[PDB]
Design a protein around this ligand. Structure first.
Ligand SMILES: CC(=O)CC(=O)SCCNC(=O)CCNC(=O)[C@H](O)C(C)(C)COP(=O)(O)OP(=O)(O)OC[C@H]1O[C@@H](n2cnc3c(N)ncnc32)[C@H](O)[C@@H]1OP(=O)(O)O
Ligand SMILES: CC(=O)CC(=O)SCCNC(=O)CCNC(=O)[C@H](O)C(C)(C)COP(=O)(O)OP(=O)(O)OC[C@H]1O[C@@H](n2cnc3c(N)ncnc32)[C@H](O)[C@@H]1OP(=O)(O)O
Ligand SMILES: CC(=O)CC(=O)SCCNC(=O)CCNC(=O)[C@H](O)C(C)(C)COP(=O)(O)OP(=O)(O)OC[C@H]1O[C@@H](n2cnc3c(N)ncnc32)[C@H](O)[C@@H]1OP(=O)(O)O
Lengths: 255, 255, 255
């Protein structure tokens, strides 16, 4: 059973679905879309229950900031959004809680989805990791990215490290993370962190244009291609060729 | 026995050899160098029979288009260039036929060759994959690249997925393939898809300049270095260092 | 026991330590910081004996050239800096000698260090490999990089091949190495070979600014993050997520 709109609103999220496209909006603009444990676990539940027809997922924020990262209340011992924090616990179980949070991000790599992050203003820490977890990022010219965790004495543990390294290379990833510095939209484009940067007023139109292009390609070939691309880096060439060819047999049969 | 010029012309290809350099030209300009099964299998035969002296291979097209991709006659049941199509068959064997086509591209990664694609106008689908299979691409400013297969309900299965991911990263590869969109020469340079972009009238000169630079480096060291570079991504650092050192023992002995 | 300043000066090196930062300066400006076997083995000894407090290492050259690569005396049979050359030997043991040289570069990848190369003028061959071995490169606008080894009939065997491929991709790495061509600072920035390029007179200030940013992030989180980033490329995503989470348990405990 998918989370209800009421349940999602209590977790700071909106979800709407129109045919093949789902839009998830981070919806705590008064806290600049700061993230909580409940928000991460509801994201996971959305992923697990999306209709089979959905093949594009767009993640956006309400207001001028994509996400200010982890809600600073998560660093206290009291419950947040009804749920215990890592600090509640510390005052195996912790490992299980973190794993449950990571499930909110992992599903954005599913082969049967194209995930798109549409980022304006800051994407800090967990928020930067959410954007990194998506297949594609479209940034407003107001976007500012930062991996703040190390500044706080923490590591990035919401699945961001792999896509960051893939995008910018290990050397630049070291520089960004170990300085915890802020990257503006122009630098983000230059470093491959954004696939497109547009004026702030055009971000919705640019997302819509991309969605239209994706929907114009048939769903089964889109999914099979994504699945191939995700394997390509780790396979040797001979193996990748065999996987490509195996995928085509199934496409040619359908056609 | 190498394919004869007559046999190659029947398959839409020219091959000339001058000392250490082989030039392969796609030669069906009236069909914008559309590719067939026979063309792919002759490419493989060229690779398998090149003289040992050849260490540079340049791939070009006749006319304004590098290649319009697969010949649309390949989507019919009739034979093409004397050979059955995948659709002839569908109306294991198919898997073997596709594997035989892939051999036309795989050999361009051989350590004892530097392969160069010199691209003007469109390189679509199989043609984009041919260019991707080469070590180096030099583009005219008129070049336009596109991975059309998914738009047609197919996957890229001519060995293009791995080099595309290596060049642009998995995230951008998803965006390019799942939108099937056209990339102009300036964007291609920006995304690392071209090592150099030059004015159309200068493409032959730029290729010649590169060939001259490659020939100025001794053949045995060029081959040994290429072989090291191809392993570097998949090895851990300790292993890569051991492989480097093993390669140098053999070079130092010769010197 | 760390090498003494006197011993290091005999090997063409200076080392100074100020709290958490070590500065290693190549110090044979009359030979444009050409490198010898003794210099490589002293670099290794510095790495092995650095105080535990050191977490940033900056590598610079004296004078206008970062390093002219291997000292051409290393291609003779006589001893250099008191030590036998590969050619002394040739006129398993050689394999052990090369491995001992590689130890001078390998340690720059240690998770408990951030290594920074500050490059002006030429970095040729072994010198290019030294810069590549560091986590971060800051280039003067006067910097010129080149992988000369293949021009000399050799391969790069001082651990440079892996970081070069990571930075520029295998295709561009082939082009650079097999032409042995010179890359200026603007192209180096464009190819990700430099994280920042600054005017020559500002290189020391830019290095100091970076050091300040690194020192502002706590040491334990910096080390744990570097260690995660170094694994990210080779792990699958599920594994990388498990490693991230394991690293965070230890950070959260400390906090
Ligand atoms: C392990 C991990 O995953 C760790 C992480 O994510 S670490 C990231 C933790 N996040 C941060 O440190 C970011 C904290 N916030 C900020 O830097 C800034 O608010 C900002 C740059 C996002 C925007 O700054 P600004 O534009 O000047 O707006 P600002 O006034 O600060 O914020 C608006 C409101 O959002 C709230 N807010 C912003 N970030 C918040 C957060 N992370 N948690 C709770 N509230 C937050 C502020 O309290 C403020 O509330 P009031 O209006 O009630 O005062
Ligand atoms: C699994 C895979 O590997 C799949 C793939 O490759 S999918 C790719 C299949 N290819 C395509 O869809 C490209 C089809 N062609 C084109 O888009 C266009 O011809 C082009 C963009 C290449 C050039 O367009 P243009 O400059 O306006 O020239 P245009 O008039 O179209 O083409 C010139 C001639 O080439 C022919 N031609 C172009 N592409 C051809 C193709 N792929 N197969 C057969 N003929 C082709 C046209 O029939 C035309 O013939 P006439 O002169 O006799 O009419
Ligand atoms: C396996 C490996 O790891 C292999 C490698 O590294 S291969 C790299 C070997 N290195 C080279 O071929 C570079 C050789 N040197 C050069 O190209 C040039 O000196 C340079 C481009 C670095 C600078 O050129 P420049 O600015 O015109 O200065 P230049 O006059 O040449 O050099 C200054 C001095 O440094 C010396 N020098 C430069 N490189 C040297 C080297 N590698 N070995 C010994 N001396 C060197 C020159 O002999 C010269 O000495 P004098 O002043 O006594 O004449």
């Amino acid at each position: 059973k998918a989370p209800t709109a009421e349940e999602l609103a209590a977790a700071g999220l909106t979800l709407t679905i129109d045919g093949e496209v789902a839009r998830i909006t981070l919806s705590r603009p008064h806290r600049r879309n700061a993230m909580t444990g409940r928000m991460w676990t509801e994201l996971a539940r959305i992923g697990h229950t999306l209709p089979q027809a959905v093949r594009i997922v767009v993640i956006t924020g309400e207001g001028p900031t994509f996400s200010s990262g982890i809600d600073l209340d998560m660093f206290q011992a009291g419950k947040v959004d009804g749920e215990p924090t890592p600090f509640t616990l510390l005052a195996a179980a912790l490992d299980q809680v973190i794993a449950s949070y990571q499930e909110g991000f992992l599903w954005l790599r599913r082969a049967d989805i194209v995930s798109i992050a549409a980022v304006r203003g800051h994407a800090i820490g967990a928020g930067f990791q959410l954007a990194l977890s998506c297949d594609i990022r479209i940034l407003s010219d107001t976007a500012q990215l930062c991996m703040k965790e190390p500044a706080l004495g923490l590591v990035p543990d919401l699945t961001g490290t792999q896509p960051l390294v893939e995008l910018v290379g290990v050397n630049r990833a070291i520089e960004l993370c170990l300085t915890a510095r802020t990257i503006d939209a122009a630098e983000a484009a230059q470093l491959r962190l954004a696939e497109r940067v547009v004026a702030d007023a055009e971000l919705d139109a640019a997302v819509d244009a991309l969605v239209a292009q994706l929907l114009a390609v048939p769903a089964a070939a889109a999914r099979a291609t994504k699945e191939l691309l995700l394997q390509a880096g780790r396979n040797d060439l001979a193996t990748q060729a065999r996987v490509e060819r195996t995928a085509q047999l199934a496409r040619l049969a359908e056609l």
